[PDB]
Structure 1
Amino acid sequence: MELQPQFNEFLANIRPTDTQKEDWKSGARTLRERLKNFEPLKEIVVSTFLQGSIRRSTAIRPLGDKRPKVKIVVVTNLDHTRMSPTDAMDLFIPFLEKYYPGKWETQGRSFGITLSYVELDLVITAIPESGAEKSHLEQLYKSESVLTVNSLEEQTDWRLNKSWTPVEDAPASEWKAHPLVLPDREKNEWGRTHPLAQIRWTAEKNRLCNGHYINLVRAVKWWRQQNSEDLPKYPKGYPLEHLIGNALDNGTTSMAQGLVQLMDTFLSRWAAIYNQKSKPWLSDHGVAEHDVMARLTAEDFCSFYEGIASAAEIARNALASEEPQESAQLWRQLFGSKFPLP
């Protein structure tokens, strides 16, 4: 059966606790307030906004004592053609030493701030556009739509529009073709990322799937976490979320039907790629030219495909079972101890 109440309880059990939520909310608010009132950066920092699976409501709670990774984007007005990423990041060392001495480090393209209950991951970005387009983008990044600390799940009325207040999405000509530039992973060069586009696409897909998309992402992340020793190291994180969003059809009815449908569509759609021992090329919702599966290997994708085949057999039988305890036993075989029984 579908067992929708049990699925709701499982989702509530795999969400980050309200404690951790308030923790990263307070951390982000404090960092933003300190950045806004820092004199040497008052002419540089355009905005500071939350991103990642936390804001997109696609994050699962950490294990053990592990801190929740809080991803923060710092939008500046620097010229990326005349400054390397290391210059932009060096601009922020005084702020860190003043407000987080002994707590901050450089993790390649990000700043890692180890706080008491959370870890703040700060990426330093810039706006490639100039003139009126740059001013309009700065106005958008300083709007309440971007500066919100609540996740997508906490406000279904959220849209990507500078006039939104806690109204539809803004037309695509105002944000789609305008990504930020961030530091590259290895090289000291600027790459392109569009987190706002990703968040807006996630919200749209969740609305098209009747609020089941982010929950299905959480469920598949929890499944991958519980069966980690049988599954490949990757995909996990955003590439996994993208695979799930690609596999899921619109108009999702329930958690169980949506899960079975997404697993079936994943299996049938990539069967040719699997038999060719290859990997899909999937366009990023933020930067169209980017392959989300660029760093994923073919062997890992095929191992994940086999794992999805097994999980899909189990989920099909869990959905087909007409006895509640039987369906629940199969759903727990897929999801583990934190799935409740009727």
Structure 2
Amino acid sequence: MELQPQFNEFLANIRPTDTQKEDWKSGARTLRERLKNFEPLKEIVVSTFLQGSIRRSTAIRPLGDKRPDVDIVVVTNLDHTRMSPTDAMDLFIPFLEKYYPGKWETQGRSFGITLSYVELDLVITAIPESGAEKSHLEQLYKSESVLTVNSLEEQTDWRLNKSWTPQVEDAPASEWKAHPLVLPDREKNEWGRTHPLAQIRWTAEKNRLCNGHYINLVRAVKWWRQQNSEDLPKYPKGYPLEHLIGNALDNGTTSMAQGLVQLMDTFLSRWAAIYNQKSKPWLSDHGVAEHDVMARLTAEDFCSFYEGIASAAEIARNALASEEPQESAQLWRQLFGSKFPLPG
């Protein structure tokens, strides 16, 4: 059976709690307020916005000592042709030392800030364009849709459009699709391209095309992976796993049970050839098509993950096909564990 109310309860159990959500919002709000009011940075900071699975509503509850993550993108007007990625990032060290002394560390492409209730990631970016195109892009990045403090599931009317306010549609692709930001890579010492706004937009659109089920299916698959982590490779996880899920899921999803079985079956058939080749697929990033989201995933890890999905899919199919509530819920619980409730 589909057991829609049981899936609803399961999803309530695996979302970040209200306390964690408030902690995410508070940490991000305080960081962005401090940046906005910091005088030595006012001439270079164009705007800031939220990226991360919490912003996209694809994150699961942290367990144990783990805390929610906020990924903050700082959009600057620095000239990436004349300033090194290291110097661009170094411009932000007095801010961190003033407000988060002893709690921040330099990472490859970002700064990490560790508080007791939240982890913050500060990504410095620059706009490669110039002139009128740069001004149009900056007006996009200063809009309400980019500055929003809300997660994706909290505002279904959100669109990537400078006219949106909390029905407009996404702006035309010609205005943003070929306009990634650049971001430092200190380990490579070069500016790379990144397009978080395109990823967020794609996620929101896919969730609409799937009747709100996409982000919940991402959460469910992440929970399944966590509950079966000793039987699975460590990778894929996080965003590459989300991306695989969004690739496998068809538009038009009508229920969690149906969508799970469909995306697992499609995953298994679509990648059967590459699995038998003992290879891994290329999947282009939304926004930067030249980038392989699976670049760091090994073929061995992909093939192990694929076998994990094949095993899970047999259970999921029998769970969906079962005509008895208790048997169906027991099969679903074999996938997801005790957070999936038995029907009363």
What is the TM-score normalised by the length of structure 2? 0.98
Residue pair 2:86, 2:186 contacting (<8 A) in 1 also? no
Moved over 2 A (4+): none
Query: Which residue does 1:305 correspond to in 2?
Result: 306
Mapped to 1, the partners of 2:10 and 2:184 lie a distance apart of 38
Q: What is the Cα deviation at residue 168 of structure 1?
A: 0.8
Mapped to 1, the partners of 2:72 and 2:10 lie a distance apart of 28
Q: What is the Cα deviation at residue 185 of structure 1?
A: 6.4
Mapped to 2, the partners of 1:116 and 1:275 lie a distance apart of 46
Query: Which residue does 1:205 correspond to in 2?
Result: 206
1:117-176 Cα shifts (integer Å, max 9, x gaps): 001101100000000111111111111101111111000000000011111111111111
The verdict on how the C-alpha distance between 1:5 and 1:334 changes in structure 2, with shifts beyond 3 A counting, is same
Mapped to 2, the partners of 1:214 and 1:19 lie a distance apart of 20
Q: What is the Cα deviation at residue 288 of structure 1?
A: 0.9
Mapped to 2, the partners of 1:145 and 1:80 lie a distance apart of 25
1:229-273 Cα shifts (integer Å, max 9, x gaps): 000111001110010001000000100000000000000000000
Mapped to 2, the partners of 1:151 and 1:51 lie a distance apart of 10
Q: Which runs of 5+ in 2 are unaligned?
A: none
Name which of structure 1's ranges 183-192 and 72-81 shifts more when overlaid on structure 2.
183-192
Mapped to 2, the partners of 1:87 and 1:61 lie a distance apart of 36
Query: Which residue does 1:155 correspond to in 2?
Result: 155
Q: What is the Cα deviation at residue 186 of structure 1?
A: 2.3
Mapped to 1, the partners of 2:23 and 2:287 lie a distance apart of 28
1:31-79 Cα shifts (integer Å, max 9, x gaps): 1111111111000011111101111111111111211121110110001
Query: Which residue does 1:281 correspond to in 2?
Result: 282
What is the TM-score normalised by the length of structure 1? 0.99
Q: Which runs of 5+ in 1 are unaligned?
A: none
Percent identity of paired positions between Structure 1 and Structure 2? 99
Q: What is the Cα deviation at residue 24 of structure 1?
A: 1.1
* Matched length: 342
Q: What is the Cα deviation at residue 102 of structure 1?
A: 1.3
Q: What is the Cα deviation at residue 104 of structure 1?
A: 1.1
Residue pair 2:85, 2:186 contacting (<8 A) in 1 also? no
Q: What is the Cα deviation at residue 286 of structure 1?
A: 1.9
Q: What is the Cα deviation at residue 116 of structure 1?
A: 2.5
Residue pair 2:89, 2:184 contacting (<8 A) in 1 also? no
The verdict on how the C-alpha distance between 1:9 and 1:185 changes in structure 2, with shifts beyond 3 A counting, is farther
The verdict on how the C-alpha distance between 1:305 and 1:185 changes in structure 2, with shifts beyond 3 A counting, is farther
1:287-306 Cα shifts (integer Å, max 9, x gaps): 11111111100000000000
- Alpha-carbon RMSD: 0.8
Q: What is the Cα deviation at residue 184 of structure 1?
A: 2.3
